């Protein structure tokens, strides 16, 4: 189980949790199957595994880990558009009268309506972690608006869930332009060969660079010119690679090789068995690896407006 | 109708067409309705024009425009395989069994004959404009694959359809940086402030600007460190504007107002009229445009016969 992105919260309080207290908690906003005539579903379901006794929550040295799944039948606004017109035409033809906005509008109802219990079904997970010995909760996700729901969710699974977003003394932007402008990052950190730089203003100018030096005379211009880094792929040590932008949101979160071997070797043939040292392992790593981010961010932050 | 992108194919050799021959041999190649157990269909209709009886071709002077349609039922891969597991399951909770590679492949396949006639369809436009008088096929896509599916359907549907794609006598990408590199265009063209820049070595790196002053140092130095244009936003005259890729293909195609408000005001009342007008002028704009285009690019490459 190796996150492909990263969302931090901090526990504000980081109230105490029972793996019962919580299993069952959890249970109470589980997921269903959506409905025929019913848009989307949201709720928990089994992280690894699965089968009506496979546990919503999963431990492994103190560690939890969680999955919230969405269903939603899919309906293309395109396809009800195309049923429209046909019923209209239908109508008019058989009928010999103009079928105007108002009923159009209103067959576009009744059309939905017999559309979505034939809609196929979009299963989506998200999946999180609770690391309550690091006082942070992780969600795998790029969205914050998917960590939200993830979250949201877990906080009616729970009545209270203390968290907010991880915040940094120090804007990001100032932070990894700094980086790039200095030609070097705090300990360990590595400025890779991608980035995005861009102006302030809104209708600003936008530069993305792919596979580019960083360091060359090229970049130092779009600094001086008054460009900032709002995205960044930075390297960890020799553990792993990822993508930052200047709203802390991890993403393209990649593990190198030698970590991913070597954890495999801790379920050995089985499959539960392979899952579980993969998000111990990267639990482990994220111990260390995201203390030493919040150092490089320079210190982490305690805000005030509740 | 105005197109919204366009690739240009060149008539190698003349082109019998009689509007009345053109319209009865589409017919043998129209679009039609997607079978229950059917993937994808493909043929013409009326550009213009709804009912049975609408013509396949819409003639404007010398002028031939064609449209083709592709229907395609919507099976997401994703749901294909989430229904498997759930099949699988089934048959090693009652069989003392478990299911194997040949035989999942073999589910699928049952899978698909029972989704597919459950599988909403999606219908996509391609027009295309017919030029003798030009010895031009203009296609609106940015897809060459598009371009190719509908040159084959119409050379299938007419026997032979002798042409090539668009080459200049200069590589594009050289004119491209050229204009950039001296900040100046060729003639009526200008060079706007958006372009995709790229390293002539391998894996080399790409750089994309947006909203950016392409005459900026920043730019310049780009060049100078050995990038090459492959993308640019351009402007011809005061007509029309457009996104030029290294390959001829004409993207991103909008045409001023004052020439759609010309349309609008020629077109008459009825919505037909309209499309008539607008089709009719983006000819004749295109008749400027094009060889200008061409001679720009340093004249182009005609296809030699033996």
């Known amino acids: 189980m190796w996150f492909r992105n990263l969302l931090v919260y901090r526990l504000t309080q980081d109230l105490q949790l029972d793996a019962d207290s919580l299993e069952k908690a959890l249970g109470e906003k589980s997921a269903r199957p959506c409905a025929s005539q019913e848009l989307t579903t ?9 089968g009506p006794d496979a546990p919503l929550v999963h431990v492994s040295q103190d560690f939890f880990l969680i999955s919230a799944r969405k269903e939603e039948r899919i309906l293309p606004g395109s396809v009800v558009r195309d049923a429209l017109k046909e019923k209209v035409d239908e109508i008019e033809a058989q009928q010999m009268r103009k079928v105007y906005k108002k009923e159009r509008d209103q067959l576009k109802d009744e ?8 809609a196929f079904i979009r299963r989506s997970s998200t ?28 906080r009616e699974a729970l009545g209270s869930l203390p968290v907010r977003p991880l915040s940094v003394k120090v804007a990001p932007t100032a932070t990894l332009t700094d980086w790039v402008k200095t030609q070097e990052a705090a300990g360990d950190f590595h400025v890779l ?6 102006d302030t203003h809104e209708d600003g100018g936008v530069v993305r660079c792919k596979r580019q030096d960083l360091t060359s005379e090229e970049i130092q211009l779009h600094l001086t010119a008054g460009k900032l880094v709002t995205q960044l792929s930075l390297a960890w040590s020799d553990k792993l690679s990822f993508v930052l932008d200047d709203k802390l949101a991890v993403k393209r979160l990649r593990f190198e090789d030698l970590l991913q071997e070597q954890a495999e070797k801790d379920g050995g043939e089985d499959a539960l068995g392979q899952l579980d040292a993969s998000f111990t392992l990267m639990m482990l790593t994220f111990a260390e690896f995201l203390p030493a981010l919040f150092e490089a961010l320079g210190g982490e932050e305690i805000p005030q407006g509740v």
């Open 42 to 50: 949201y709720g928990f379901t089994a992280p690894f595994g699965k």
């Open 111 to 118: 059309i939905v309506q017999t559309l979505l219990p034939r």
């Open 193 to 198: 060969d991608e980035c995005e730089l861009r």
């Open 127 to 154: 999946f999180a972690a609770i690391a309550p010995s690091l006082g942070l909760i992780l969600v795998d996700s790029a969205s914050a608006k998917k960590a939200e729901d993830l979250l949201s969710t877990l």
